[PDB]
Write an enzyme that holds these catalytic residues in place. Structure first.
Site, PDB file in Angstrom:
ATOM      1  N   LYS A  53      56.706  26.601 -46.007  1.00  0.00           N
ATOM      2  CA  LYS A  53      56.009  27.888 -45.948  1.00  0.00           C
ATOM      3  C   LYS A  53      56.288  28.617 -47.268  1.00  0.00           C
ATOM      4  O   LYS A  53      56.813  29.734 -47.282  1.00  0.00           O
ATOM      5  CB  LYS A  53      56.540  28.727 -44.779  1.00  0.00           C
ATOM      6  CG  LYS A  53      56.394  28.090 -43.396  1.00  0.00           C
ATOM      7  CD  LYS A  53      54.941  28.057 -42.933  1.00  0.00           C
ATOM      8  CE  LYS A  53      54.825  27.547 -41.494  1.00  0.00           C
ATOM      9  NZ  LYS A  53      53.404  27.468 -41.022  1.00  0.00           N
ATOM     10  N   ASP A  58      61.276  33.594 -31.558  1.00  0.00           N
ATOM     11  CA  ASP A  58      60.838  32.949 -30.325  1.00  0.00           C
ATOM     12  C   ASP A  58      61.634  31.677 -30.029  1.00  0.00           C
ATOM     13  O   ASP A  58      61.125  30.566 -30.158  1.00  0.00           O
ATOM     14  CB  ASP A  58      59.333  32.643 -30.423  1.00  0.00           C
ATOM     15  CG  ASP A  58      58.929  32.074 -31.784  1.00  0.00           C
ATOM     16  OD1 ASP A  58      57.717  31.905 -32.027  1.00  0.00           O
ATOM     17  OD2 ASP A  58      59.815  31.787 -32.617  1.00  0.00           O
ATOM     18  N   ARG A  87      45.170  22.097 -42.588  1.00  0.00           N
ATOM     19  CA  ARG A  87      46.051  22.485 -43.683  1.00  0.00           C
ATOM     20  C   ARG A  87      45.858  21.549 -44.867  1.00  0.00           C
ATOM     21  O   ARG A  87      45.516  20.380 -44.692  1.00  0.00           O
ATOM     22  CB  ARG A  87      47.514  22.458 -43.232  1.00  0.00           C
ATOM     23  CG  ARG A  87      47.861  23.517 -42.190  1.00  0.00           C
ATOM     24  CD  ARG A  87      49.344  23.494 -41.865  1.00  0.00           C
ATOM     25  NE  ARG A  87      49.733  24.516 -40.892  1.00  0.00           N
ATOM     26  CZ  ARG A  87      49.803  25.821 -41.143  1.00  0.00           C
ATOM     27  NH1 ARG A  87      49.509  26.294 -42.345  1.00  0.00           N
ATOM     28  NH2 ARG A  87      50.175  26.656 -40.183  1.00  0.00           N
ATOM     29  N   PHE A 131      46.513  14.836 -21.628  1.00  0.00           N
ATOM     30  CA  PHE A 131      47.085  13.801 -22.486  1.00  0.00           C
ATOM     31  C   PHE A 131      48.610  13.812 -22.423  1.00  0.00           C
ATOM     32  O   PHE A 131      49.241  12.784 -22.173  1.00  0.00           O
ATOM     33  CB  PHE A 131      46.649  14.007 -23.939  1.00  0.00           C
ATOM     34  CG  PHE A 131      47.285  13.043 -24.908  1.00  0.00           C
ATOM     35  CD1 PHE A 131      46.861  11.718 -24.976  1.00  0.00           C
ATOM     36  CD2 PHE A 131      48.313  13.462 -25.752  1.00  0.00           C
ATOM     37  CE1 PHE A 131      47.452  10.820 -25.874  1.00  0.00           C
ATOM     38  CE2 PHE A 131      48.913  12.573 -26.653  1.00  0.00           C
ATOM     39  CZ  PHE A 131      48.481  11.250 -26.714  1.00  0.00           C
ATOM     40  N   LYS A 132      49.198  14.982 -22.647  1.00  0.00           N
ATOM     41  CA  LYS A 132      50.650  15.113 -22.641  1.00  0.00           C
ATOM     42  C   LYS A 132      51.295  14.851 -21.288  1.00  0.00           C
ATOM     43  O   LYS A 132      52.450  14.444 -21.224  1.00  0.00           O
ATOM     44  CB  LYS A 132      51.046  16.493 -23.181  1.00  0.00           C
ATOM     45  CG  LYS A 132      50.660  16.665 -24.644  1.00  0.00           C
ATOM     46  CD  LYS A 132      50.912  18.066 -25.178  1.00  0.00           C
ATOM     47  CE  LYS A 132      50.409  18.176 -26.614  1.00  0.00           C
ATOM     48  NZ  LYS A 132      50.608  19.534 -27.203  1.00  0.00           N
ATOM     49  N   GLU A 135      58.252  35.653 -27.270  1.00  0.00           N
ATOM     50  CA  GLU A 135      58.620  36.412 -28.458  1.00  0.00           C
ATOM     51  C   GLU A 135      59.518  37.612 -28.162  1.00  0.00           C
ATOM     52  O   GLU A 135      59.239  38.415 -27.266  1.00  0.00           O
ATOM     53  CB  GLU A 135      57.346  36.859 -29.195  1.00  0.00           C
ATOM     54  CG  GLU A 135      56.392  35.689 -29.497  1.00  0.00           C
ATOM     55  CD  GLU A 135      55.085  36.107 -30.157  1.00  0.00           C
ATOM     56  OE1 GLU A 135      54.504  37.129 -29.743  1.00  0.00           O
ATOM     57  OE2 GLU A 135      54.625  35.402 -31.082  1.00  0.00           O
TER      58      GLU A 135
END
Length: 335
Positions: free
Chosen positions: A36, A108, A211, A304-305, A319
């Site tokens: 980042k 978080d 990205r 899927f998971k 948060e």
């Protein structure tokens, strides 16, 4: 104290605490700041009576439409956050280091949600965002609170991925390999290009952004081959699917994925099988497939998971906001 990023020795001591902590998180590693690179890093920690680090928080400061910055410690701090008294001390150190430049300090942590913990946090002055906020949208939490985590410690004798599952699932996982899918892995530039091609193809197919490759290059330079690993699935010379996994602390985390158009021969299943095998081979406690929108068959991510995680999804506290500038917080943060 605040960490002097220009002090190699201080930096290393900070990193060693992070890497050896059972609460360690890859997004809290100083390497995350290098990924980042458009955010400003500010890191703090606390020491016990012997001068040994006992708690740490890696913060990243982002820009906003106001004169204040957004201070975020993704999945931090690194310590037992339920020990609220210690948490306050660490947070007080962070606020000192922020020096009035941020409107809020948000963290978080991957700790279970509970009414008692949520209440304690509010009692200590924090503003919590979990069951009281929208599931999706710009008002939702940055990270999903519901995550599909596989606890490998429930299978201490497991030698291979298949040992963790019922016959119906064993069949699903065996299928791609039976049909010729093969997976290779590493953290070289070639593996990255393979990932990037499937990643961008996937993005275009769903009409979503992606990205830039440099983001992943910085990631590769920040973490070694024992921490970051790219898995590439192919069938007879044809690239089908890929996935990136990060091993840190007590878990291996499936973070990114990509699949080409058309027939993929269930390659995504083979990628998962191999990542899980890496967790078993390294005696890692958890394998994290990431978040889901909701525990429903109407959720593709869940469907899927759920193939790999039959237990209920883990629900985190969400948060925790240490409000520093009330006016700006009210302007930029709403339920």
């Amino acid at each position: 104290p605040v960490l002097n990023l220009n002090d190699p020795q201080a930096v290393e001591r900070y990193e060693e605490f992070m890497r050896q902590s059972p609460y360690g998180q890859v997004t809290q590693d100083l390497g995350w700041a290098k990924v980042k690179n458009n955010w400003e890093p500010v890191d703090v920690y606390l020491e016990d009576d012997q001068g040994a680090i006992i708690a740490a928080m890696s913060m990243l400061l982002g820009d906003t439409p106001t004169d204040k910055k957004f201070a975020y410690a993704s999945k931090g701090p690194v310590m037992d956050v339920t020990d609220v008294d210690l948490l306050d001390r660490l947070v007080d150190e962070a606020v000192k280091a922020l020096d009035g430049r941020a409107y809020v300090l948000r963290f978080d942590p991957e700790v279970a949600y509970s009414d008692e913990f949520n209440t304690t946090l509010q009692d200590h002055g924090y503003v919590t965002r979990n069951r009281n906020v929208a599931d999706a949208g710009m008002h939702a939490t940055i990270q999903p609170r519901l995550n599909m985590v596989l606890d490998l410690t429930k299978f201490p004798d497991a030698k291979t991925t298949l040992d963790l599952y019922p016959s119906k699932t064993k069949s699903k996982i065996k299928r791609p390999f039976r049909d010729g899918v093969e997976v290779h892995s590493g953290n070289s530039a070639t593996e990255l290009d393979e990932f990037f091609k499937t990643y961008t193809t996937m993005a275009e197919r769903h009409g979503i952004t992606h990205r830039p490759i440099e983001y992943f290059q910085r990631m590769q330079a920040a973490f070694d081959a024992d921490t970051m690993r790219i898995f590439v699935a192919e069938r007879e010379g044809k690239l089908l699917s890929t996935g990136i996994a990060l091993k840190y602390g007590r878990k291996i985390w499936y973070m990114y994925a990509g699949s080409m158009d058309g027939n993929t021969y269930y390659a995504p299943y083979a990628v998962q099988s191999e990542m899980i095998q890496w967790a078993l081979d390294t005696n890692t406690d958890l394998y994290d497939l990431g978040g889901i929108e909701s525990e429903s068959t109407d959720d593709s991510l869940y469907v899927f998971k759920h193939v790999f995680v039959k237990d209920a999804p883990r629900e985190y506290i969400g948060e925790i906001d240490k409000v520093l500038d009330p006016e700006v917080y009210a302007e930029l943060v709403k339920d």
